[PDB]
Amino acid sequence: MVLSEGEWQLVLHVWAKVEADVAGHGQDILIRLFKSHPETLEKFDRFKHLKTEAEMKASEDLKKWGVTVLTALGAILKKKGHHEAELKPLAQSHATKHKIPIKYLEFISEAIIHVLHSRHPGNFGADAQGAMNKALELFRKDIAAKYKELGYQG
Ligand code: HEM
DSSP: OOOHHHHHHHHHHHHHHHHTHHHHHHHHHHHHHHHHHHGGGGOOOOTTTOHHHHHHHHOOOHHHHHHHHHHHHHHHHHTTOOOOOHHHHHHHHHHTTSOHHHHHHHHHHHHHHHHHHHHTTTTTTTHHHHHHHHHHHHHHHHHHHHHTTTTTTO
């Protein structure tokens, strides 16, 4: 839960690359999530009728939601762990409305790592991977704690 300064800078350095193309990274990540863990697709009534990869690729709406998701994540990462304010609304909606278990957040964490490797063969190596994994694990543990604070089991 306590990352080094150097680890946070690895996280934010690669995130700067994500921010050069938020929608593309976002679409890539959701497509990867749905492919690797198809049960997650059922959480999205708006996407569950995209039945092939050609269909997912062509979904402009999916790109837009990629932006929605990554924009929230980016703001969280930039807080370097001091993300209580950002987690409040997100835990509320994800615990009580969307009903996303923490395990699904582990699934999307894996998709994020995968896409960062795919998109950044030059500057997302072992150290950057380790750092990003720590940052995403912190997010998951803290949001799990917030679910519980709200009275919910993630
Ligand atoms: C990094 C992890 C995630 C972030 C930062 C994130 C962020 C967001 C944001 C900002 C919204 C819109 C505002 C809101 O309702 O809170 C949203 C909506 C939503 N999210 Fe998440 N999300 C994440 C992971 C997931 C995962 C893994 C799933 C399902 C497997 C999921 C399911 C949904 C659904 C179903 C909605 C509403 C979609 C709709 O209204 O059509 N989220 N998310």
